[PDB]
């Protein structure tokens, strides 16, 4: 969860990406919008002789 | 009487925010350039609710002050009456009959809140009476606008007909919704700025595809 400054319409509780994945939400405690980015990952490669 | 819809009645179908993203959806909606029933007040008859009701009325003094939504509309059913007195929009479902001439001077729910233009879209899903509405001062305006769900009624009450009301001590337009496919233009701040009805013309299908 980020310190996002996204401006939403007052009825708009959620948001989605271009592929309709949920990227931003309206927190019920604080009605400012928080952008959501799921955590880092990656493939693991072993470099050895 | 009758006239043209002029690309009006488009509402927000979902609460999803999109920034510069064009999104297509299938929902009950007013068709583009559809034929809408026109009555001028001399009358306020009884009309069926059907699947959905589109309403638009332009009065500077707001002669239309109320609506009643009931299945039989003769105090035999929980008729949802939505009457705006002064600045208080008042919503009730009483089984008490109104005056003999329907103008303003079992209640299981109570909510109390040509210059001016009021647009309304009514539909009822699972008893939840959904009202997409807009109030702003300005037959029908040619420009595009997006209707917002100003109220959504949790009443859970079945309704199959409706009737508008007057007030005494008005030109309005009535339309019906249809299942149509749209293409929606979400701007940078999520306001729907353009809409394309796919079932209108082949250019619209080419834009929708
Ligand atoms: C406008 O209509 C409403 C609907 O009755 C009136 O406001 C409320 O009426 C109920 C009915 O008993 C009361 O319980 C509430 O206390 C009233 N006030 C509010 C703020 O909800 C209102 O009095 C009417 N206004 C006029 C000028 O007749
Ligand atoms: C709507 O129907 C009426 C009567 O059938 C007709 O006079 C009018 O031109 C129609 N409007 C449109 C936009 O088709
Ligand atoms: C609503 O009431 C009308 C009139 O009694 C009836 O014909 C209709 O089937 C009812 N609908 C529902 C969903 O109960
Ligand atoms: C959207 O909101 C921002 C808020 O800073 C504003 O500057 C901008 O004019 C608005 N409209 C568009 C089309 O970006």
Q: Would you call B204 helix, strand, or coil by DSSP?
A: helix
CB contact under 8 A, B17 and A8: yes
Q: What residues of B are in contact with residue A20 (Cβ under 8 Å)?
A: 16
Q: Distances from the Cα of B8 to the Cαs of B11, B109, B116, in angstroms?
A: 9, 31, 16
Q: Which chain A residue has the Cα nearest residue B151?
A: A11
Q: What is the 3-state secondary structure (H, E, C) of B102-148?
A: CEECCCCCEEECCCEEEEEEEEEECCEEEEEEEEEECCCCCCCCCEE
Round to whole Å and give the CA distance between B112 and B85.
Answer: 10
Query: Residue B165 is inside which H or E element, if any?
Result: strand B161-167
Across chain B, which distance is largest between two alpha carbons, in Å? 55
Phi, psi of B58 (to 5 degrees): -120, 105
Give the domain CATH number at B27: 2.60.120.960
Instruction: Give B79: exposed, middle or buried? Use CB within 10 Å, 0-12, 13-18, 19+.
Output: buried
Give the residue ranges of DSSP H helices in chain B: 202-208
Experimental method: cryo-EM
Number of domains forming the structure of chain B: 1
Tally DSSP H helices, then E strands, for chain A: 0, 3
Residue located nearest, by CA, to atom 10 of ligand 4: B189
Instruction: Give B49: exposed, middle or buried? Use CB within 10 Å, 0-12, 13-18, 19+.
Output: middle
| Closest ligand to the CA of B31 | 2
Contact B182, B24 (CB under 8 A): yes
Name B61's Cβ contacts closer than 8 Å, sequence gap at least 6: none
Q: Residue B190: give the domain boundaries.
A: 2-209
**Resolution (in Å) of the shown entry?**
3.7
Q: Which chain B residue has the Cα nearest residue A22?
A: B16
């Amino acid at each position: 969860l980020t310190e996002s400054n996204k401006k939403f319409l007052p009825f708009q509780q959620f948001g989605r990406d271009i592929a309709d994945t949920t990227d931003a939400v309206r927190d019920p405690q604080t009605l400012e919008i928080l952008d959501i980015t799921p955590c880092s990952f990656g493939g693991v490669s072993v470099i050895t002789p | 009487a009758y006239t043209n819809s002029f690309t009006r009645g488009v509402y927000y179908p979902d609460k999803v925010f999109r920034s510069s993203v064009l999104h297509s959806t299938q929902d009950l909606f007013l068709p583009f350039f559809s034929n809408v029933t026109w009555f001028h007040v001399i009358d306020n008859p009884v009309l069926p609710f059907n699947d959905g009701v589109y309403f638009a009325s332009i009065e500077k003094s707001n002669i239309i002050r109320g609506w009643i939504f009931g299945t039989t509309l003769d105090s035999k059913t929980q008729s949802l009456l939505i009457v705006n007195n002064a600045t208080n929009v008042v919503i009730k479902v009483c089984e008490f009959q109104f005056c003999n001439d329907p103008f303003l001077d079992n209640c299981t729910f109570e909510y109390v809140s040509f210059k001016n233009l009021r647009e309304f879209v009514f539909k009822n899903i699972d008893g939840y009476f959904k009202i997409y509405s807009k109030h702003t001062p300005i037959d029908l305006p040619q420009g595009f606008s997006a209707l917002e769900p100003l109220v959504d009624l949790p009443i859970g009450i079945n309704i199959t007909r409706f009737q508008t009301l007057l007030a005494l001590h008005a030109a309005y337009y009535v339309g019906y919704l249809q299942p149509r496919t749209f293409l929606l233009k979400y701007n940078e701040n999520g306001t729907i700025t353009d809409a394309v009805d796919c079932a209108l013309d082949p250019l619209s299908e080419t834009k929708c595809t």
